[PDB]
Amino acid sequence: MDSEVSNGSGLGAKHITDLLVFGFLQSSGCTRQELEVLGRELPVQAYWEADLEDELQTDGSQASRSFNQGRIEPDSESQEEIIHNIARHLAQIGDEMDHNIQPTLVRQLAAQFMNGSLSEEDKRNCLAKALDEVKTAFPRDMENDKAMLIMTMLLAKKVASHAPSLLRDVFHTTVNFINQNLFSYVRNLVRNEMD
Numbered sequence: 001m002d003s004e005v006s007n008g009s010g011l012g013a014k015h016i017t018d019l020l021v022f023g024f025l026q027s028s029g030c031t032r033q034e035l036e037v038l039g040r041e042l043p044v045q046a047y048w049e050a051d052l053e054d055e056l057q058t059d060g061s062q063a064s065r066s067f068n069q070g071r072i073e074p075d076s077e078s079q080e081e082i083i084h085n086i087a088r089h090l091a092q093i094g095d096e097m098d099h100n101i102q103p104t105l106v107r108q109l110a111a112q113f114m115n116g117s118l119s120e121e122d123k124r125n126c127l128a129k130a131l132d133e134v135k136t137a138f139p140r141d142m143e144n145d146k147a148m149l150i151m152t153m154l155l156a157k158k159v160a161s162h163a164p165s166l167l168r169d170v171f172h173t174t175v176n177f178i179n180q181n182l183f184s185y186v187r188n189l190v191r192n193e194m195d
Contacts, residue, residue, distance in 0.1 A: 006121065012179040018043070020087040020183065021175030024153065027088030028095045030160045030170070038171030086184050090174060094153030101154060109133040110151030114159065114173070123169050127155060127176040145185040152177035 018041060025035030041047065079085065101107035110130030113119060119126040134148040155173035159166055166173075182188040 009122065009125075014179060014183050016083060016087065016187070017175050017179045017183050019084055020090050020178045021171040023084055023087030024091030024094070024156065024174045025171065026091070028091040029153075029156055029174075030167070034160070034167065037167050083184060083187065086186060090149065090153055090178070091156070093150060094157040094174075097150050097153065098157060101150065101157075104137060106134060106138055106147060107151060107154045109137060110148075110154050111158065114155045114163075117163075117166060117169070123166075124172055124176055127152065127173045128180040131177045131180055142185060142189075145181065148177050148181065149185070 022035055022039030022041070025032075025038055029035070030038075097107070110127075110133060112133065113126035113129045115126070117123060120129065130151045131148040134151045135144045138144050138147040140147070152174040155163075155176075156170040159170045159173060163170065178184065
């Protein structure tokens with residue numbers, strides 16, 4: 001009797017990557033305060049950002065003589081940076097995914113690893129382990145690639161409310177696949193495209 005082996009770490013890491021984690025929540029997932037907890041990460045240097053806030057103001061009034069004819073609401077869409085958008089869109093996809101996340105046991109597999117606060121001796125390998133799995137079932141480019149990604153958010157989606165003790169891990173899970181994969185499938189696609 002004798003048998004035991006397992007190891008392998010490294011590869012990945014990206015600025016935009018982490019953005020997916022912190023960005024994901026920023027879009028959806030747990031809550032704002034969450035993105036802060038999970039998002040709250042000190043890289044190799046001295047991270048730090050900012051972004052002016054917004055506000056609003058209602059109105060009342062009483063005294064008013066018959067005189068009015070219009071009740072249309074405002075509508076203006078203008079947001080810079082699309083890449084980042086995809087980051088946050090990730091989480092948003094997680095929630096939406098809940099709609100149908102298991103057309104054959106997709107999120108099921110990825111969810112397989114999503115167990116214990118440390119599986120396969122490494123709280124993060126399990127997830128990435130799904131990427132390979134999710135693909136093992138639903139492999140492909142944008143289809144699979146995007147499929148596996150759905151997994152990352154799956155953990156958080158569930159974990160976020162399933163594993164409230166793995167908050168930090170929750171985020172890592174999301175930026176796990178992307179981090180282990182090509183950040184944004186679109187990013188790579190962009191590179192591939194155009195001479």
